[PDB]
Design a protein around this nucleic acid. Structure first.
Ligand code: MG
Ligand code: MG
Lengths: 236, 51
RNA sequence: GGUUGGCCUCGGAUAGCCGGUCCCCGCCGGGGGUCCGGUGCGGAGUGCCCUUCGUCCUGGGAAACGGGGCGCGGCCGGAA
RNA sequence: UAGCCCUGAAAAUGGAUGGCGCUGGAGCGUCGGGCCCAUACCCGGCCGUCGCCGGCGUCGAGAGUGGACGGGAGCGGCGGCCCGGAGCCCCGCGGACGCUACGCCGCGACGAGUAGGAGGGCCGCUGCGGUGAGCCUUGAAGCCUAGGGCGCGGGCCCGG
RNA sequence: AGAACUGGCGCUGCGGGAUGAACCGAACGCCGGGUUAAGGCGCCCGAUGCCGACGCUCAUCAGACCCCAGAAAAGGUGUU
RNA sequence: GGCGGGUCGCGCCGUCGGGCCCGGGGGGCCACGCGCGCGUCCCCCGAAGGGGGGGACGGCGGAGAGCGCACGGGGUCGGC
RNA sequence: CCGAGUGUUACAGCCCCCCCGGCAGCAGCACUCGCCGAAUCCCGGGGCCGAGGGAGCGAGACCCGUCGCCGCGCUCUCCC
């Protein structure tokens, strides 16, 4: 299996034409001429009894619902969320100081690390300057500040992913006794592994931070608007 | 009614020549651009090699 | 209902502002020479707080007034 | 001579470039680039009307804009010892909705209205012939209702 | 008062003319987004809060936008 | 002896036009049975009135198997 | 003696205009030549508002029409 052999210059236009591609593919010498399991039978198991039982499984349904909706009308390409495309703004390169706008943090300044497979850009300001763990944040809820730090070769744990950062609930009790789920008081003590693998990235973001003259005082601070300070008059 | 002039491949259902008219005007305005960027260099290059 | 306050010259505009030696008004104010700045930088397109997450460990620079006060005691300025 | 301004230029309730006001214009003339919003125009939804239709093939076996048999002659192709021949579905016995034809569906264009004229009314009132093996003293009619709804409306249904 | 031609009002809402039968745009099923016409854009009142252009004009009764709602002959070493 | 109208040949212009062609000495093409024979054209070998080539053909002699993708594709889903 | 402001005649001893011959090499350009533009035209990014509504000629289909039209890729040959 060769590669595409026709590089797209613009989205969905090949660089080579129809007859230019008949020769790049050598189509002039490859025109061609040459030209269910329902169920294995189950055995008898019995006296006065033969005929290893007939081919039947996955039988007809017990109950047809009284009415049904018709089938849908097929549409083109509306592929689910695991398959669309992932995008960034050009102002957010790895190493960018971000400004969180909307969380529980609300103005804490963090360091952008890696853009995950879901568009949620993984980020941490360190836990010693801020109080920000390795949280995901959404892309369009930050502000890319025009200062950077080179963290191009920091390290990255492969185990931290979209499946790593999730939230969990498992509804066992169907009875309306007065427990609050019996385990949603549990602020998460799964931190025992999360406390290990932030130190494995804290230890080598901070020497990048401590090499800039006063960048670490800049990350303890929070962002605010005060009196004559207007965005659109402002350079972030 | 999806719009011609705004998406491709509706034009190509109405006009197949619209695609080959379109990469011909993308191939040439890339080589008219590679010519003019190099020529604007080619004056101030030896004008700097003078200085 | 609001998301920090500015605690103040008079004014001129074919002109004004600052700093200033000298001789006149109970140790302060009136004048002129002189030095300044001026599409006002001794610029409310500005200024002081400040964008203060807190604490501990822990060294420098800066600072010898302490800063909030339920303090107690005093005075004297602001009547449109 | 002609532009602006002034004189000519006097009316009775207190008064009207609409007012407040306006003089490096918020006046007049000649222009510019922005900008504002009609039920008008464009795109989309939904309602009705009108025009041109579709589907009785519920035909999961229906397949036909050309069609068969079976004989006179030729192949490419399916199984060779260069001679060769219809298989009716079945290892699954299965396969949504529909079509009150006075119904259902599709597409397109249109929608001011007095006097007036037609149509539709499962709008409503009273009584009759049929009909609901209707409803009710375990509560009918009527009336009332910050109760819940439906219909574009006429109105209607339910709760108390 | 009475005709001609065409459009309107009467039978017709809506945007502008402050106000309104007839003027100027435009005709109307119930809405959402876009754009405009006539007309505007100091503040009532949406929009010039453009670093708009060029001139003319001072009134002790200035002037200010179709129909439309106030003026003539004559005159001014008032200014252009 | 001058001036217009129609006609011919001369050299001169234009990214002329005929896909032109005809032979000779990189970019583009929705243009693809080597075997050879059906018409038609062309270039050729010495002849002198034959053959061999290539080209294009709207005719015939040379002349299937669709597999698994992706999609500005018959009016949005998410297996967020 | 220099510096400065006026008034005069004089055509280089600041310059400016009209010619008679040239080069870099020309950009509708170092935001005034802004012109008029696109078979002489494409690319990319934002903001808003809406998402209305049994397609299987094939398999005799079968858990479950990712289907037509359109535009593409790879393999059913090899090598680097
Ligand atoms: Mg009537
Ligand atoms: Mg008119």
């Amino acid at each position: 299996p060769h590669c595409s052999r026709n590089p797209v210059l613009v989205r969905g236009i090949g660089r080579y034409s129809r007859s230019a591609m008949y020769s790049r593919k050598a189509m002039y010498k490859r025109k061609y001429s040459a030209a269910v399991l329902a169920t294995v039978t189950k055995p008898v198991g019995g006296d006065k009894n033969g005929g290893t039982r007939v081919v039947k499984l996955r039988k007809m349904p017990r109950y047809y619902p009284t009415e049904d909706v018709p089938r849908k009308l097929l549409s083109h390409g509306k592929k689910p969320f695991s398959q669309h495309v992932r995008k960034l703004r050009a102002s957010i390169t790895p190493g960018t100081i971000l400004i969180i706008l909307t969380g529980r943090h609300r103005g804490k300044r963090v360091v952008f690390l890696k853009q995950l497979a879901s568009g949620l850009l993984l980020v941490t300001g360190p836990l010693v300057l801020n109080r920000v763990p390795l949280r995901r944040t959404h892309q369009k809820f930050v502000i890319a500040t025009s200062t950077k730090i080179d963290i191009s070769n920091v390290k990255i744990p492969k185990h931290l992913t979209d499946a790593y950062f999730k939230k969990k609930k498992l509804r066992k009790p169907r009875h309306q006794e007065g427990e609050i789920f019996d385990t949603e008081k549990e602020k998460y003590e799964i931190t025992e592994q999360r406390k290990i693998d932030q130190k494995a990235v804290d230890s080598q973001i901070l020497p990048k931070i401590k090499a800039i003259p006063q960048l670490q005082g800049y990350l303890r601070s929070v962002f605010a608007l005060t009196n004559g300070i207007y965005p659109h008059k402002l350079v972030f | 009614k999806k719009n011609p002039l705004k998406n491709l491949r509706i034009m190509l259902k109405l006009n197949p020549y619209a695609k080959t008219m379109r990469r011909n005007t993308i191939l040439r305005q890339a080589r008219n651009h590679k010519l003019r960027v190099d020529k604007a260099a080619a004056a101030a290059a030896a004008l700097q090699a003078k200085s």
